[PDB]
Amino acid sequence: SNVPHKSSLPEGIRPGTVLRIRGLVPPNASRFHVNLLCGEEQGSDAALHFNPRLDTSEVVFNSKEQGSWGREERGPGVPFQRGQPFEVLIIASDDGFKAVVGDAQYHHFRHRLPLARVRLVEVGGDVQLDSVRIF
Amino acid sequence: SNVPHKSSLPEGIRPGTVLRIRGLVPPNASRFHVNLLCGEEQGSDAALHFNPRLDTSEVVFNSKEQGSWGREERGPGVPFQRGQPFEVLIIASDDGFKAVVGDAQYHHFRHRLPLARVRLVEVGGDVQLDSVRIF
């Protein structure tokens, strides 16, 4: 079912914070996502929207501010396959977020909103989440 | 074995850099080390010297500056054992290096030298490396 997973970042995040997401992509998976949000309310801003699309074969990055989406960036290829498990690392640095998918740097997303406003991680869509660890 | 391993970091490292080292501690291992050096010269300054000592059951962290070693810091116990594989994440943040071993925050080493001087990662001693990835 789709009740996204929600995880609080109490101290929030800073350069050096690492998010490790492990999961498995369902066989008929259409697409899933990972959002770094700035509040717990519906429609609060999203510092990062990472959205791997299996059906359209593309991975979309984007942010949402004041209620409207922004400049959508796309990554090189789709490092995910249906029925296969994956490990993603989202690394916050001073100039942006580094997305590492299974041992390879996949994309660098420069900060659009301030890192200090990020307060929670939401993982939703067509995905079997095994665990979310923050280091 | 695997290697008196060397990885050059031409542009250095910044907050948000992740070092992932995987390997095996062989059967009669005494000790091994992971060094973040400032140059290629022998006896180069070290921003970080991570030294698990299996023969004495301690994990030591230190730095080397201008040819002389600093004061050693010891971590909480030995999360390594002979005949067992391991995974270590050394994450650089704004105020120090976080050492993560076996999926748990193990120690935090406050910076002693500017992160900007680091130029090489060297892994050596009684260890059989699987891989060293820098993200």
CB contact B99 to A (< 8 Å): no
Residue carrying structure tokens 């935090």: B108
CB contact B108 to A (< 8 Å): no
Contacts with A118 (C-beta within 8 Å, 6 or more apart), sequence order: A9, A12, A13, A36, A37, A38, A47, A48
Which candidate from B16, B103, B105 shows the least CB-CB separation from A93?
B16
Dist. CA B59–CA B67, nearest whole Å? 22
Find chain B residues with C-beta within 8 A of A19's C-beta. Answer: none
Residue A53 marked as a ligand binder: no
Residue B44 buriedness (CB in 10 A; 0-12 / 13-18 / 19+): middle
Closest CA to B34 of B76, B66, B70, B3: B3
Per-window interface: A 77-96 vs B, CB < 8 A:
89, 91-94
Dist. CA B111–CA A83, nearest whole Å? 43
Domains within chain B, CATH numbers bracketed: 1-135 (2.60.120.200)
**Binary contact (A15, B103; C-beta < 8 A):** no
Residue B71 marked as a ligand binder: yes
- Point out which residues pair with B51 in neighbouring strands: B60
Dist. CA B61–CA B69, nearest whole Å? 11
Contact B94, B14 (CB under 8 A): no
Contacts with A81 (C-beta within 8 Å, 6 or more apart), sequence order: A25
Closest CA to A134 of A34, A46, A49, A44: A34
CA distances from A88 to A20, A59, A80, B5, B77 (A): 6, 13, 10, 26, 29
Strands (E), B9-135: 17-25, 32-37, 46-53, 58-65, 68-69, 73-74, 84-92, 96-101, 104-110, 120-125, 128-134
Residue A105 buriedness (CB in 10 A; 0-12 / 13-18 / 19+): middle
CB pairs under 8 A, 24+ apart, for A57-60? Answer: A59/A106, A59/A107
Look up residue B84 and give its two tokens.
């067992």
Residue B73 marked as a ligand binder: yes
Dist. CA A7–CA A122, nearest whole Å? 7
The SS3 call for residue A115 is: helix
Resolution in angstroms, to 1 decimal, for this deposition? 1.9
DSSP helix, strand, coil percent of chain A (3-state; round to 5)? 0, 55, 45
**Binary contact (B89, A133; C-beta < 8 A):** no
Closest Cα in chain A, distance from residue B15 (Å): 5
| Optimal mutation site among A17, A93, A133, interface B, most CBs of chain B within 10 A | A93
Alpha-carbon dihedral of residues A17, A23, A26, A30, nearest 10 degrees?
0
Which candidate from B16, B98, B133 shows the least CB-CB separation from A92?
B16
Residue B12 marked as a ligand binder: no
Look up residue A22 and give its two tokens.
């492990």
CA distances from B116 to B17, B34, B91 (A): 12, 18, 15
Closest CA to B101 of B54, B53, B49, B59: B59
- How is the beta sheet containing B128-134 ordered, strand by strand? B104-110, B96-101, B84-92, B17-25, B128-134
Dist. CA A44–CA A64, nearest whole Å? 8
Look up residue B123 and give its two tokens.
């892994």
Look up residue A116 and give its two tokens.
């200090």
Find chain B residues with C-beta within 8 A of A103's C-beta. Answer: 133
Look up residue B51 and give its two tokens.
């030294």
**Binary contact (B16, A100; C-beta < 8 A):** no
Phi-psi region of B89 (alpha: psi -120 to 50; beta: other; left: phi over 0): beta
Q: How was this structure determined?
A: X-ray
Look up residue B78 and give its two tokens.
């030995």
**Binary contact (A18, B14; C-beta < 8 A):** no
CB contact B111 to A (< 8 Å): no
Closest CA to B23 of B99, B88, B71, B98: B88
CA distances from B122 to B45, B91, B93 (A): 12, 16, 20
